[PDB]
């Protein structure tokens, strides 16, 4: 199986430097072009740079020339993007992709992508609060409950339920940027009313930028 | 540089419909045009390359064509899992460039939301802030009005909404509206109410609680 | 300025799709008509009924 895995993305101050890696497996990067492509609210999908590891030839987008460099280590089957003099406009998901693989003249595999956030704001871990099921969150024999993941920076956070064993009926809402400059989101799940009190429900919250990992048991309130 | 212009920006159609989206290059790109799909939480995925050729594993209901500098992507029989954004990309000249995308949504029957409300947690109340959450589950279409009232006074400027993308199983939406107050303000008022207006309801639905009640 | 033109696409078999075009009024207009003409190749001659001063269109295809 062909795979590309980006790593290295994170919060960086304007003017700062970051280095991304793109680890390839299932093919040899000597046989293809490797590209970096980014995706942002402001510019959508935007090509950044490419390299042909066989001969080392590179090309760059005008907007990153001089500030970014692309390179590759064929012995580690890995490509890199050095990112200097960073600006707000560089905030984006960075993907690596291959081109010309197996004779296909398109980008036929893309990695999951890694988020780069260019900001002077500080890292902050979320508080995780229960959304307890109650007489006000049930109807038709089913009940809603959840977790409120509040006041974190930067993105991303991940939320799962019962260590990923619970997926049916889950809605994890898009993160919202609050006026404070911090993010917040809720994740809810709908379950049988009759399961409350017998089945344990835990939301697993991870905010890697702050090394925050919370497992929150959510249950009906006391009275 | 070459620009790629995609139309329409949004297209909504029923399961089984034939849908066509378009991409225009600002100058000759030969056939060097690819189409990508991006599903919710996903990376771009290759569908069509060299204007008209289907990538391996892509369903045969997808097809592409070229006429001069005009390119089309067609889905012959729209499936629920085709709900996604679609992007075209030319690789004829450097820099390779992408279109702005076309969002494709699924039409389905009207469904009223299930409406629920959650007081601030006691845990949160230990700090100085209260979040009150109103939840609208599994409704269609997306349009919905959610208004907050506190002791019957209409609230404004102190809530935020978030809406999921269409569900993979039933093509519905869900929405959260979060009302944020100081602890002090929350403890000063009694009745917290979310009022929901939606096409599937015969009249607006109010869900409420009194602070302090179990 | 930036406007959104909302379009109903009404096909001869009664099926209905909806679409949006954004840009200046003049650009969005042109793109809507261009898209209509393209669909007309497969779905038959189109007719376009403008309402809301041009900002909403009903486009019916003859089949």
């Amino acid at each position: 199986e062909v795979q590309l895995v980006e790593s290295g993305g994170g919060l960086v101050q304007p003017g700062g430097s970051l280095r991304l890696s793109c680890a390839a497996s299932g093919f040899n990067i000597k046989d293809t072009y490797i590209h970096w492509v980014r995706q942002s609210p402001g510019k959508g999908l935007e090509w950044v740079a490419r390299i042909y590891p066989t001969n080392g030839y590179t090309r760059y987008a005008d907007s990153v020339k001089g500030r970014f460099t692309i390179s590759a280590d064929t012995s580690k089957n890995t490509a890199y993007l050095q990112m200097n003099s960073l600006r707000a406009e560089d905030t984006a998901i960075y993907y690596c992709s291959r081109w010309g693989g197996d004779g296909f003249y398109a980008m036929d595999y893309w990695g999951q992508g890694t988020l780069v956030t260019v900001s002077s704001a500080s890292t902050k871990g979320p508080s995780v609060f229960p959304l307890a099921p109650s007489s006000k969150s049930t109807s038709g024999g089913t009940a809603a409950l959840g977790c409120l993941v509040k006041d974190y920076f930067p993105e991303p956070v991940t939320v799962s339920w019962n260590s990923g064993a619970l997926t049916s009926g889950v809605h994890t809402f898009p993160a919202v940027l609050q006026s404070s400059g911090l993010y917040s989101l809720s994740s809810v799940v709908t379950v049988p009313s009759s399961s409350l009190g017998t089945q344990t429900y835990i939301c697993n919250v991870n905010h890697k930028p702050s090394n925050t990992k919370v497992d929150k048991k959510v249950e009906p309130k006391s009275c | 540089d070459i620009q790629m212009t995609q139309s329409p920006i949004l297209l909504s159609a029923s399961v089984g419909d034939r849908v066509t989206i378009t991409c225009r290059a600002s100058q000759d790109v030969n056939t060097a045009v690819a189409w990508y799909q991006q599903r919710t939480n996903g990376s771009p995925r290759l569908l069509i390359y060299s204007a008209s050729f289907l990538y391996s594993g892509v369903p045969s209901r997808f097809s592409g064509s070229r006429s001069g500098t005009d390119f089309t992507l067609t889905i012959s029989s729209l499936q629920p899992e085709d709900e996604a954004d679609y992007y075209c990309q030319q690789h004829y000249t450097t820099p390779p460039t992408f279109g702005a995308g076309t969002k494709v949504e699924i039409k389905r029957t009207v469904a009223a939301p299930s409406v629920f409300i959650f007081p601030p947690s006691d845990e949160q109340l230990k700090s100085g802030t209260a979040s009150v959450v109103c939840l609208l589950n599994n409704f269609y279409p997306r349009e919905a009005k959610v208004q907050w009232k506190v002791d019957n006074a209409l609230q404004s400027g102190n809530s935020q909404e978030s809406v999921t993308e269409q569900d993979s199983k039933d093509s519905t939406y869900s929405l959260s509206s979060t009302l944020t107050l100081s602890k002090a303000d929350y403890e000063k008022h009694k009745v917290y109410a979310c009022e929901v207006t939606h096409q599937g309801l015969s009249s607006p639905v109010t869900k409420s609680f009194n602070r302090g009640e179990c | 300025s930036e406007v959104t033109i909302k379009v109903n696409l009404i096909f001869a078999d009664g099926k209905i799709q909806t679409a949006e075009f954004k840009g200046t009024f003049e650009e969005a207009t042109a793109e809507a008509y261009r898209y209509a003409a393209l669909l007309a190749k497969v779905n038959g001659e189109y007719t376009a009924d403008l309402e809301d001063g041009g900002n909403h269109m009903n486009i019916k295809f003859a089949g």
């Binding site: 995706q39 898009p174 993160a175 | 919710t40 990376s43 | -």
Partner: peptide
């Protein structure tokens, strides 16, 4: 329509 990191989707 505008791309959102959180969903990896255009929002219109």
């Amino acid at each position: 329509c505008q791309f959102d990191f959180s969903t990896x989707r255009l929002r219109c």
